[PDB]
Design a protein around this nucleic acid. Structure first.
Ligand code: MG
Ligand code: MG
Ligand code: MG
Ligand code: MG
Ligand code: MG
Ligand code: MG
Ligand code: MG
Ligand code: MG
Ligand code: MG
Ligand code: MG
Ligand code: MG
Ligand code: MG
Ligand code: MG
Ligand code: MG
Ligand code: MG
Ligand code: MG
Ligand code: MG
Ligand code: MG
Ligand code: ZN
Lengths: 127, 25, 63, 214, 97
RNA sequence: GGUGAAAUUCUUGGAUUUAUUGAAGACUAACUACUGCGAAAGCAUUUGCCAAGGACGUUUUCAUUAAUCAAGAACGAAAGUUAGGGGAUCGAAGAUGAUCAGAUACCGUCGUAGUCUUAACCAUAAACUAUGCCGACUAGGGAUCGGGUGGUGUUUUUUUAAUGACCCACUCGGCACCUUACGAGAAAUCAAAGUCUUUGGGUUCUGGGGGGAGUAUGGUCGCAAGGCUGAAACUUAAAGGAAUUG
RNA sequence: AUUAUUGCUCUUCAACGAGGAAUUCCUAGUAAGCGCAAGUCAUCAGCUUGCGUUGAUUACGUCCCUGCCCUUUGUACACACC
């Protein structure tokens, strides 16, 4: 029915990326992260920073080739926080709303056979 | 003062007298 | 400019930090048989007819 | 000043034979110049998608598979096997508390001399009528189950290369002969081959490589 | 004096277990003594039940949620999440919800 | 990037993000739990090899061979020390960017030692259950872990069975949760902290107001940092415990 | 009675064009407009205490701010967080 890509969203704290590439990964198609479409450092990740992301690419997604695409949402994950940076939600809904055709996505962020001890140390980061 | 530092105080102290007594051996 | 009349089916609660938004269920006379929940900006009693300025939608709590 | 889209050679992808659809997705090269040409520069790339996206039915909601692209023949390019994954939302669904867990593994070879690594998993099924809320394993019941899993997992491969193992689990005949001998030791639920990965491939051999085409 | 007989948390017979690192404040606390929730949460969300399967292929789809286990550190646990602070009798109710 | 907000900081060297594979060292997520084991420190991927062990089973064997222990000895988390091997990661010093009236910190950054490992050391933890060890007795309940008994029990078929997991009665030995209070106590609570002025089963050890002080000294140990042992003068009316109301 | 107690007349004819950051008061004969009596008083109300006259738009909610309660909690304070 439609022509595919890979949507892949990496929503983190104090920024949110959004970029599609070729299904074989190896070849991009347009990015735009949150940190651009707004300027105020802290403001780098808020709801709208996302709907403002997927506006300057979902368009260009719908402008170079892709009419459809599957997403691979990602958290900073790792030895770090591993829990969804809010601005991925407000990005997806903003490419489901882009008219863009959605279908079949899973959780891709890193979760390990735990190791490489976290930073800040045994007393923890304290405040 | 905190048990640990007061212990440590008296151990740094302890070590200086070694030192000041070495001088005499 | 397709409008929508709404029959307050009953008074629910007062939502939203402030507390003037009033939770309510409104039926539609222009073909009943279905319920829709909406919020409001005024003081409201049962059987206040309302102007849904979009047919298909219903919110929840207000923050 | 460039905007490479007024430059990008453009392809669709072709899958092989032991499944459903062969035609796939779309991609981006660059003009097939002399020096930096659109043939042997790339192509080789790989692509993953769930298998209901090429088995059509949702009695196959997870199982991802990486396909290595091998050949080219004028603005078309084929692919062959490069490992199978799964899905988190099912792994994580299936990795549930108040129960035990088992996974064993083997390395092995095939008729066509690809060596790879396969895995497995299965979970203590609480048997209906079990008052006790945990259905637990006895280690000595796990190790012998690892053994049997090992018994089967190394008589299933070395059967006509990937193609034959490939088409040995797409309907998961294994998943039950696993469960076959398994009923003789304990219960068990789920019982899936989870992952598998390739690493030591033979030469291209472009005559038996084209098997799954047409 | 002892204002808890399961002590810190749950540790009778073992005598040592290993540090799990609190996800928000990054402390070290004995696995057992953690305090833990499960993050069963539908990957999409509230308003998006419509906008999803609508501009999406397949039939309805299925919907594939994501799970993560959150270990908190008291010092963390207190602050935000499940803890409150109880009276000298309710500190007994280990019961969930 | 990072943060409550920041900044130091990287970014023609396409940083951050993506894809293919490569390397190094550590670690063992999920299943992981009022559950298991070890004398404790402690111990979670696989299989092999090594020898070790509790419980049970037992109309098997020896027969008082035993209980507890000054000296003495085996073990001993973390750090720390010697010599290599390593060195990702996190990260005592040090430097830094913010912060503050100050801010040697808290936060951020950079990072030496260190973190792992072999050989040697070291012998400390709130090394905790702040609760010695063997023995007897004293009170209810449902759990659960290993062993065993029992069934015209259930679930698995093929041909009943034989397996295997289950279900249940009962039983030893485990970690525990509970209800009580015959009884204990200063009370918090405790099924042992019970059978204690109605004072005695066996045995080891420790304490005799608070400081001074675990200081000095002597002996000893260890490369060392330190360990073990370990006073007194003077001083002093409280210091202390559980619980009650502010 | 000058430093002008007040009052009257003519002349003079300011700023001020609805007020930033901010903060008060209040739910019905109330708000706010309006004047009068009373106090002080020899003289002097832009003050206050009560009076009536005209007489509204908006709530009949909540906890967001804010203040204050009340319960749990911790406590080494009891001359009680100066
Ligand atoms: Mg704090
Ligand atoms: Mg000299
Ligand atoms: Mg206390
Ligand atoms: Mg594992
Ligand atoms: Mg002697
Ligand atoms: Mg290093
Ligand atoms: Mg410093
Ligand atoms: Mg400075
Ligand atoms: Mg310093
Ligand atoms: Mg310990
Ligand atoms: Mg303890
Ligand atoms: Mg009993
Ligand atoms: Mg009593
Ligand atoms: Mg002295
Ligand atoms: Mg007290
Ligand atoms: Mg009190
Ligand atoms: Mg007057
Ligand atoms: Mg006055
Ligand atoms: Zn924490």
């Amino acid at each position: 029915s439609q022509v595919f890509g890979v949507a892949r969203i990496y929503a983190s704290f104090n920024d949110t990326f959004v970029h599609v590439t070729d299904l074989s990964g190896k070849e991009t198609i347009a990015r735009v992260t949150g940190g651009m479409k707004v300027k105020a450092d802290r403001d780098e990740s808020s709801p709208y920073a996302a709907m403002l992301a997927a506006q300057d690419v979902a368009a260009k997604c719908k402008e170079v080739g892709i009419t459809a695409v599957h997403v691979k949402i990602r958290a900073t994950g790792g030895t770090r926080t591993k829990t969804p940076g809010p601005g991925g939600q407000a990005a997806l809904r903003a490419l489901a709303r882009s008219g863009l055709r959605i279908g079949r996505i899973e959780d891709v962020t890193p979760v390990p056979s735990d190791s490489t001890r976290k930073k800040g140390g045994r007393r923890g980061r304290r405040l | 003062m905190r048990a640990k530092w007061r212990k440590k105080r008296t151990r740094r102290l302890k070590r200086k007298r070694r030192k000041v007594r070495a001088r005499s051996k | 400019t397709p409008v929508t009349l709404a029959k307050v089916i009953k008074v629910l609660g007062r939502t939203g930090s402030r507390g003037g938004v009033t939770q309510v269920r409104v039926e539609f006379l222009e073909d009943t048989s279905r319920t829709i929940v909406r919020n409001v900006k005024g003081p409201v009693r049962e059987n206040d007819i309302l102007v849904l300025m979009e047919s298909e939608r219903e919110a929840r709590r207000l923050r | 000043v460039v905007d490479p889209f007024t430059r990008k050679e453009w392809f669709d992808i072709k899958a092989p034979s032991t499944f459903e659809n062969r035609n796939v997705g779309k991609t981006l090269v660059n003009k097939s110049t002399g020096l930096k040409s659109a043939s042997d520069a790339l192509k080789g790339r790989v692509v993953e998608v769930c298998l209901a996206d090429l088995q059509g039915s949702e009695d196959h909601s997870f199982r991802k598979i990486k396909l290595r692209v091998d050949e080219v023949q004028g603005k078309n390019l084929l692919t062959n096997f490069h490992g199978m994954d799964f899905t988190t939302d099912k792994l994580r669904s299936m990795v549930r508390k108040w129960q035990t867990l088992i996974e064993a593994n083997v390395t092995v070879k095939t008729s066509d001399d690809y060596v790879l690594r396969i895995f497995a998993i299965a979970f203590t099924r609480k048997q209906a009528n079990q008052v006790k809320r945990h259905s637990y394993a006895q280690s000595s019941h796990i190790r012998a189950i690892r053994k049997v899993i090992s018994e089967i997992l190394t008589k299933e491969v070395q059967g006509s290369t990937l193609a034959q193992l490939t088409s040995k689990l797409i309907p998961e005949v294994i998943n039950k002969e696993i469960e076959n001998a398994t009923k003789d030791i304990f219960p068990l639920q789920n019982i899936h081959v989870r992952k598998v990965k390739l690493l030591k491939q033979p030469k291209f051999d472009v005559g038996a490589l084209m098997a799954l085409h047409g | 004096p002892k204002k808890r007989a399961s002590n810190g948390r749950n540790k009778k017979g073992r005598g040592h277990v290993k540090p799990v690192r609190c996800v928000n404040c990054s402390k070290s606390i004995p696995k057992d003594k953690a305090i833990k929730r499960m993050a069963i949460r539908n990957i999409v969300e509230a308003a998006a039940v419509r906008d999803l399967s609508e501009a999406s292929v397949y039939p309805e789809y299925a919907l594939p949620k994501t799970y993560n286990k959150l270990h908190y550190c008291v010092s963390c646990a207190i602050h935000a999440r499940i803890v409150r602070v109880r009276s000298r009798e309710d500190r007994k109710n280990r019961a969930p919800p």
